């Protein structure tokens, strides 16, 4: 019911509504995958002409303008279609935007530097490492930084960023958010992202897109950024009168050592890793965070006996472990069902707590006939997370499980990790680059500091407060608690609370409504 903006094919996905871009404003778009976020951006960018639900018909620009006349969006579209707007679009699929890239990072950026901001962006996005590398040879994260950089250098009216936090480490995400905020004043900016802290930093306004993945999406009205993210956490949109999730994502709610490790040293070629002694309690979640190339995965690999430490040990030396590696690939002949059944009797019995909380809530129950090699990154991720979690263990290690996940699935996963760990009185280490995930479920954290590729030093497990304080300080940002949802809120650099908390040394504030 309502007015269809676009439909790709008969009986296919349909989109209802569009957000209006606003000048001198950063507009966030948020929702689970498969609901039309990328479609919305491509419409806004002028790459797709809305067909108003008829994929047979070739709608012209004139027709689109007649259909919008009187409405909020008309004027944007008039300017778009009358070629009065220069549009920059940092596309979602960065790996596809790679095979048309000739030359080094420096020379690509030098070619397109229209705003004389090359050197500025180099600094802001910390690109000196990438500087004389071939665009062709770049990893996910280097490509993402190169395209975001390239977008910042362009002189344009509208800048569109589809998921710029993908492949970025915790530090890079924050730098990218600072860079966009700083360099794109007095422009139309639209951003889609699944990292809530990135969105919170970047956005003035927020639209939620909700619906059923691959069936339909509807765009909410514009909310003030803070409110929009809060309604998303509550899972309720007041204006639309819409329960978009049956439960809420709540922050800040309310003995024996199961394992202990000495100082751990590991040298790999050039890179030296040092990890401080520590211990973990039964039921406890230790988040691990730090930039990439710093030894987090090496540390994971030491804990699972894949790599031997050069000095130091973990007691007890042999325990039942369950491991979700960072690098995920289809390595199995059989179905999702066969793979899950192999892992646990629980995982697929409609009878257990697991099936409904994890399996079903991950929507893995819909992929049972699929064989593992058919699955997308997102689906393999959930499959490996679910399998890992279904196994009865003393120790769980999950490496970057939020990669490939949308904004909903990461919190469903987060919740599950907590549930399994506490249920089974186990230790869980989770490495992740989404800071809200840590805030949401980590009981203590380990911070990795140093120089990517050369040296990493990791602290013992400390309180979120103790670790975040030191981590945020280096990163030069301050966090407070939102009054309504208790979610972390990042003070925009320069802001009222930002310089005061900075003087106090209170970078990670546990105070409500700061
Ligand atoms: N060219 C297309 N033809 C048919 N279906 C498409 C096409 N492009 C996207 N879709 C579908 O529309 C839905 C919404 O996709 P998209 O806008 O990319 O979602 P999101 O960005 O929110 O993940 C998904 O079903 C997607 O596969
Ligand atoms: N087997 C290895 N041999 C030599 N160097 C390695 C090996 N495995 C990882 N490295 C290097 O060690 C550093 C630490 O990597 P890793 O533990 O993968 O970091 P993170 O998970 O923090 O990104 C990286 O620079 C990586 O290239
Ligand atoms: Mg998309
Ligand atoms: Mg890693």
XYZ file of C-alpha atoms and ligand atoms in Angstrom, residues 8-9 13 32-40 92-93 163 214, ligand 1:
43
model
C 13.260 -3.764 -10.675
C 11.013 -6.465 -12.059
C 11.804 -5.866 -4.826
C 19.355 -3.825 7.239
C 20.485 -5.050 3.840
C 18.213 -5.940 0.955
C 15.753 -3.049 1.681
C 16.823 -0.499 -1.035
C 19.558 1.651 0.547
C 21.797 1.305 -2.490
C 18.789 1.707 -4.840
C 17.944 5.023 -3.018
C 29.449 0.178 -2.108
C 31.296 -2.474 -4.053
C 29.039 1.979 3.379
C 14.664 -8.397 -1.025
N 19.386 -4.686 -11.010
C 18.548 -5.375 -10.196
N 17.633 -6.230 -10.712
C 16.818 -6.925 -9.879
N 16.897 -6.770 -8.537
C 17.805 -5.913 -7.986
C 18.653 -5.212 -8.817
N 19.439 -4.432 -8.038
C 19.105 -4.644 -6.753
N 18.095 -5.535 -6.725
C 17.449 -6.022 -5.472
O 16.749 -5.007 -4.726
C 16.882 -5.267 -3.321
C 17.481 -4.062 -2.613
O 18.874 -3.960 -2.975
P 19.791 -2.759 -2.540
O 19.212 -1.399 -2.865
O 21.172 -3.004 -3.057
O 19.714 -3.028 -0.926
P 20.685 -2.545 0.281
O 21.651 -1.533 -0.267
O 19.784 -1.955 1.245
O 21.365 -3.853 0.745
C 17.671 -6.579 -3.238
O 16.674 -7.517 -3.613
C 18.501 -6.478 -4.495
O 18.983 -7.728 -4.963
